[PDB]
Amino acid sequence: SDGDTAMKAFNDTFWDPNAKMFWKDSKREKHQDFWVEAELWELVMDAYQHTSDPALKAELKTQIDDVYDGTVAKYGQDWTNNPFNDNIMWWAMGSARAYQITGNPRYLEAARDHFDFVYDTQWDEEFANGGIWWLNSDHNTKNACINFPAAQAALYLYDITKDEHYLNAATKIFRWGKTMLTDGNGKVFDRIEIEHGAVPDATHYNQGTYIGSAVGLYKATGNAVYLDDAVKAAKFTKNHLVDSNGVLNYEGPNGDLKGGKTILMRNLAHLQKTLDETGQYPEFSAEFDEWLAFNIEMAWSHQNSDHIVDGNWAGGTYESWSSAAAVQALNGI
Numbered sequence: 001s002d003g004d005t006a007m008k009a010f011n012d013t014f015w016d017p018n019a020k021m022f023w024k025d026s027k028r029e030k031h032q033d034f035w036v037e038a039e040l041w042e043l044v045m046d047a048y049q050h051t052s053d054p055a056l057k058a059e060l061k062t063q064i065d066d067v068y069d070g071t072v073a074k075y076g077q078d079w080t081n082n083p084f085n086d087n088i089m090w091w092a093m094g095s096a097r098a099y100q101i102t103g104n105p106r107y108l109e110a111a112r113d114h115f116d117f118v119y120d121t122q123w124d125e126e127f128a129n130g131g132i133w134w135l136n137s138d139h140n141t142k143n144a145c146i147n148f149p150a151a152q153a154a155l156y157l158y159d160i161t162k163d164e165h166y167l168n169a170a171t172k173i174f175r176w177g178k179t180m181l182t183d184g185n186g187k188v189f190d191r192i193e194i195e196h197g198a199v200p201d202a203t204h205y206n207q208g209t210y211i212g213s214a215v216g217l218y219k220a221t222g223n224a225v226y227l228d229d230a231v232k233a234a235k236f237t238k239n240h241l242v243d244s245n246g247v248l249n250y251e252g253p254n255g256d257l258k259g260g261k262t263i264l265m266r267n268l269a270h271l272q273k274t275l276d277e278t279g280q281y282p283e284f285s286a287e288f289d290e291w292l293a294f295n296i297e298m299a300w301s302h303q304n305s306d307h308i309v310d311g312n313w314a315g316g317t318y319e320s321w322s323s324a325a326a327v328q329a330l331n332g333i
């Protein structure tokens, strides 16, 4: 019941049923940012997939549609006017998942049209020998936060359509990103800036989307190297993006990063499921499971009386992005 309790509390605190959007914080003065709203959309989907309560499941399934509808009312159906390719791709990825859950073809169309806009027009072979640009306005940097989500979105589209076009895209994007945006041992770099080079700053959400795309490529291709890729990035996270007690770091004050544990936990759950199914990396699997469970318990021990957990997991206004990670964590496998 913990996942159910956490999701219900999150909705009670942050869901606006009038605007069909999440509030940015408990003051209820501003709705959540566009890109983060896609991530909260995926949280609703994860809760939907996790719960065993048929009543809550039906409510969450409806909410999947309402989140899309509330966003389209404010931002339109065509997001290609947004200069941030990642903003577009986070929504394309969400849309692909919403299709999988609802079977509603509008989500497949949203996913495919937006993925195609970004991949077909924003991939470049010249700078850095490959990669998708962060922006469709100015072309100055190629970033983990667009490239690995794009590989994930391609993998969802492959699974849905069976069109090898999308597997080929995922393979190509990931190969480039592994080569140019990692150290080869699981540290994912933030971006490569033209006239500068790589910026080797690691963050939770970029570890996460790298891990998720690697797991998805493992499953689609049968090539064990991808599982090894995922494990190295999980190990790096567990050892190097934690405090002295092994609790995942707080990445504030940056507003985009503060909630990044949400994306990380979503993707660590994918790795956990694949390790459990396959029996591969059994020693690491045991250590990883124990460490995940520890993080989750520590986070939830800081819940307030309304069952909301601030995103500083080691320690009056609660924010929906920062608070989402603890909810995500209870709505995994």
Ligand SMILES: *[C@]1(OC[C@H]2O[C@@H](O)[C@@H](O)[C@@H](O)[C@@H]2O)O[C@H](CO[C@H]2O[C@H](CO[C@H]3O[C@H](CO[C@H]4O[C@H](CO)[C@@H](O)[C@H](O)[C@@H]4O)[C@@H](O)[C@H](O)[C@@H]3O)[C@@H](O)[C@H](O)[C@@H]2O)[C@@H](O)[C@H](O)[C@@H]1O
Pocket (backbone or CB within 6 Å): 033, 034, 035, 036, 084, 086, 087, 090, 143, 144, 145, 146, 190, 191, 199, 201, 202, 203, 250, 251, 252, 254, 255, 256, 257
């Ligand atoms: C996309 O959203 C764009 C914009 O949309 C607006 O509507 C609104 O929602 C805004 O809030 C959105 O920004 O772009 C997001 C931002 O991407 C850029 O910025 C992030 C964060 O950059 C910072 O952090 C990195 C990483 O390292 C730093 O933090 C770590 C961890 O704490 C430290 O260890 C390290 O020392 C360092 O301090 C850093 O490299 C940057 O210089 C900067 O300090 C980057 O991660 C991106 O690559 C972009 O530069 C993005 O988060 C989303 O994808 C969103 O869709």
